[PDB]
Design an enzyme around this catalytic site. Sequence first.
Site, short mmCIF file in Angstrom:
data_model
loop_
_atom_site.label_atom_id
_atom_site.label_comp_id
_atom_site.label_asym_id
_atom_site.label_seq_id
_atom_site.Cartn_x
_atom_site.Cartn_y
_atom_site.Cartn_z
N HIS A 41 0.80 -1.22 0.00
CA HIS A 41 0.00 0.00 0.00
C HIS A 41 0.85 1.29 0.00
CE1 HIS A 41 0.21 1.12 4.30
NE2 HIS A 41 -0.19 -0.10 4.68
N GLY A 143 2.53 6.14 10.19
CA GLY A 143 3.93 5.99 9.84
C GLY A 143 4.57 4.71 10.37
N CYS A 145 3.56 1.67 9.67
CA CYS A 145 3.42 0.61 8.66
C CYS A 145 4.77 0.12 8.20
CB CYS A 145 2.56 1.08 7.49
SG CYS A 145 0.82 1.36 7.92
C1 QYI Z 1 -2.15 2.90 5.50
O1 QYI Z 1 -3.16 3.60 6.25
C2 QYI Z 1 -4.29 2.85 6.73
C3 QYI Z 1 -3.92 2.37 8.18
O2 QYI Z 1 -4.61 1.54 8.75
N1 QYI Z 1 -2.88 3.01 8.76
C4 QYI Z 1 -2.43 2.88 10.10
C5 QYI Z 1 -1.71 1.80 10.59
N2 QYI Z 1 -1.35 1.62 11.87
C6 QYI Z 1 -1.69 2.57 12.74
C7 QYI Z 1 -2.41 3.74 12.40
C8 QYI Z 1 -2.78 4.73 13.34
C9 QYI Z 1 -3.49 5.83 12.96
C10 QYI Z 1 -3.84 5.97 11.63
F1 QYI Z 1 -4.54 7.08 11.27
C11 QYI Z 1 -3.53 5.07 10.67
C12 QYI Z 1 -2.80 3.91 11.03
C13 QYI Z 1 -5.34 3.93 7.01
C14 QYI Z 1 -6.22 4.15 5.79
O3 QYI Z 1 -6.92 2.95 5.42
C15 QYI Z 1 -6.13 1.83 5.32
C16 QYI Z 1 -6.74 0.74 4.72
C17 QYI Z 1 -6.03 -0.45 4.59
C18 QYI Z 1 -4.73 -0.50 5.04
CL1 QYI Z 1 -3.82 -1.97 4.79
C19 QYI Z 1 -4.11 0.57 5.65
C20 QYI Z 1 -4.81 1.77 5.80
#
Ligand code: QYI
Lengths: 305, 302
Positions: A41, A143, A145
């Site tokens: 992603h 961040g 990820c």
């Molecule tokens: C890559 O961003 C997504 C995500 O879940 N990120 C995050 C991961 N970890 C912690 C987080 C904490 C706060 C936050 F606002 C976002 C976080 C958020 C948007 O929707 C998606 C949809 C699918 C996928 Cl596989 C990722 C994502």
Amino acid sequence: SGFRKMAFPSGKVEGCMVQVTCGTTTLNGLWLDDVVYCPRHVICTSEDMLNPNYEDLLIRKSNHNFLVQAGNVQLRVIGHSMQNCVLKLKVDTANPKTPKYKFVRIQPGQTFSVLACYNGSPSGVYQCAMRPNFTIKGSFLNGSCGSVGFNIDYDCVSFCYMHHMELPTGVHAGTDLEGNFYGPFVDRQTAQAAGTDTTITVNVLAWLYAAVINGDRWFLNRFTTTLNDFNLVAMKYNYEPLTQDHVDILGPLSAQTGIAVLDMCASLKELLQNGMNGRTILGSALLEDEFTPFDVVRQCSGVTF
Amino acid sequence: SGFRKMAFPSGKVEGCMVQVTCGTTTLNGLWLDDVVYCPRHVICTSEDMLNPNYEDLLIRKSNHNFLVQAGNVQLRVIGHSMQNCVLKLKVDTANPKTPKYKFVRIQPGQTFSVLACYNGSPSGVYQCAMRPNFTIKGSFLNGSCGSVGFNIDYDCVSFCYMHHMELPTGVHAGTDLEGNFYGPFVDRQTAQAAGTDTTITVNVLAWLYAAVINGDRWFLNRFTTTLNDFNLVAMKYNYEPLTQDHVDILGPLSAQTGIAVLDMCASLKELLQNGMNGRTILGSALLEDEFTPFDVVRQCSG
Ligand SMILES: CO[C@@]1(C(=O)Nc2cncc3ccc(F)cc23)CCOc2ccc(Cl)cc21
Ligand SMILES: CO[C@@]1(C(=O)Nc2cncc3ccc(F)cc23)CCOc2ccc(Cl)cc21
Ligand SMILES: [Cl-]
């Protein structure tokens, strides 16, 4: 003495963390040999996440669209391929700090250490378990990820998890290092929720044995139970079934403390039906399920890496 | 989202852990530049431990009595000196993995990561706090002496603790990296005991602000309290007094959540009175006191 939630020493993994940037998205990558692994992603925009065609989005990218930073050194991307939900960025330089490693897919109940990272820089290490609902109760901000989960066996780092997303309940979802999600999750901005979670029974029993080893015996009783009767009780409290494999795995701890596995199950049965009654076990008022039988043996014996 | 007890990445400290042997005694040392730091009790026998005269035991040792092992490489000891309860072994090789570091003496309530080691080999990393009674609730077996506690702020490792002893209640006592013990403890096997431990009030408040930041508000109430009335109540539950310094330190968290420190003190008073009534706060059924205000800001914001 003492029983702490302990993570593996993170050094071997810290030497693999890099920052991966593609467009406006910055996240973490794992640099092993000449390949950087990261969530696929990273190629997506916020609009793309709604319904992404990752092959179509990836074919539009060239090697120079991926900026990989290892410390203050920019690595040069010379290839890119996708494997399930992981992007593999071929780089010109092999990581001189690459440890002996394996990619392992873990089962729910198994525990691992997470090296939480931001901008390719490790910020913290914590221990967690793959919940029965395939989520992890992690601590991740935007961040994070690409942060990874691992276990260290002897001198070999077994990478078992890569962070991809946070579900609406604050719990986390990710893949193994081959890009296969743990759980029925997809890397797409769509309605996704963690299923009903259960307690990891074999882990609670392991932690009860850790309490006994550390001098906590108040919960012990004269009673024993059958595996079937215990499972009938356990199911009622949203506890995972205990199998004969779990009983066998608890064998060493059962021999060290002198408490038979079904003898400890009768303690757990009583704890579920009656509570702790103002008491604690290893400084906890809840039954802890994020220590496996192997974690208990490792910590109550001091295995090194 | 999520709130975990988080340790610092231990890599910078792992590259400093060495094994120190003196006679039959083997423990851990911290190799920084050309000096290996370890507990001075490495020179003692089990009998020497009741009333050791360290200066008398040390004067009898030569450099070659200390065997220092860094991985599978034996380092050469070229000097030795004692600084309080720490033995400093000058070695002939500077540690190429020496990080940017400082020696810091911490105050009770402060948290740090412990890299538990056996035979100079790291086995695990965990988080803990210096209890108000100057002990730490660690996880240390025989051979863990010399394991260190630290924080990493920015790229600098601040060494704050070195493990020396396990008290009869299973809790642990040690020194800063200048060899000064935390608490009224001595490196002797004389009858010693941890004083009555109390809860770190400012840390519980910080953790209640962490719960509010993560969406948990069930424990809040419409009440406030004076600092003095809060302390009168807090003392009855074995909670450390909350000082004006603590209230000032909680200022940023108060501003971020919109809950005044003394309003959060009123929720805590009520939590102490009522218990949790089957509820949890950040996955815990007890009030957590091993997260400082600084840890909460670091983990919730960056
Ligand atoms: C890559 O961003 C997504 C995500 O879940 N990120 C995050 C991961 N970890 C912690 C987080 C904490 C706060 C936050 F606002 C976002 C976080 C958020 C948007 O929707 C998606 C949809 C699918 C996928 Cl596989 C990722 C994502
Ligand atoms: C250095 O050995 C002592 C010690 O507390 N060792 C230990 C430290 N940590 C964990 C331990 C776990 C089990 C165990 F049997 C011993 C442990 C042993 C008892 O006498 C003393 C007296 C003073 C001092 Cl500064 C140290 C010690
Ligand atoms: Cl401090």
